[PDB]
Paper text:
RyRs are calcium-activated calcium channels critical to excitation/contraction coupling in heart and skeletal muscle. Ca2+, ATP, and caffeine are well-characterized activators of RyR, synergistically activating the channel by inducing a rotation of its activation core and pore opening. We use cryo-EM single-particle snapshots of ryanodine receptor type 1 (RyR1) to exemplify the discovery process facilitated, and the new insights revealed by our approach. Broadly speaking, conformational changes along CC1 involve the cytoplasmic shell, the activation core, and the pore; those along CC2 involve only the cytoplasmic shell.
In qualitative agreement with the experimentally estimated association probabilities, the binding interactions become favorable from state 3 (“S3”) onward, becoming most probable at the FINISH conformation. Information from at least six structures along the functional route on the energy landscapes was needed to identify a thermally accessible pathway by MD-based piecewise free-energy simulations (see “Methods”). At the hotspot, the trajectory crosses over to the +ligand landscape with ~0.24% of the probability of association with a ligand, terminating in the region of lowest energy on the +ligand landscape (“FINISH”). Three-dimensional (3D) movies compiled along heavily populated conduits from the START point on the −ligand landscape to FINISH point on the +ligand landscape (the white curve in Fig. 1a) reveal the conformational motions relevant to ligand association, in some regions with near-atomic resolution (see “Methods” for more detail).
Residue numbers in the entry: 1 to 107
Amino acid sequence: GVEIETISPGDGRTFPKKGQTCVVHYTGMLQNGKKFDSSRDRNKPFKFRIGKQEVIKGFEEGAAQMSLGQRAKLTCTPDVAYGATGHPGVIPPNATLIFDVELLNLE
């Protein structure tokens, strides 16, 4: 379950394909909570590739459903990343995570 609410400007066609190292200015958020992880805070815009399951499934499926320039808004389900496990100190178990994802990519 990935609910994409794209803020309109972009190109609408440059989709991430397999093995494409793509660039996302991500900015995390918790449902009824604050930020937890931000490439914008690090100013290191997270050059990640598609097809290795490096990123979580809530962040991976949101990438290919966007295009270059687009600014979507992830509402990631708990069961795809940390719903029963939970990260120690960052992500509690059964958290519905929120992301400011703007696909300004490469390749």
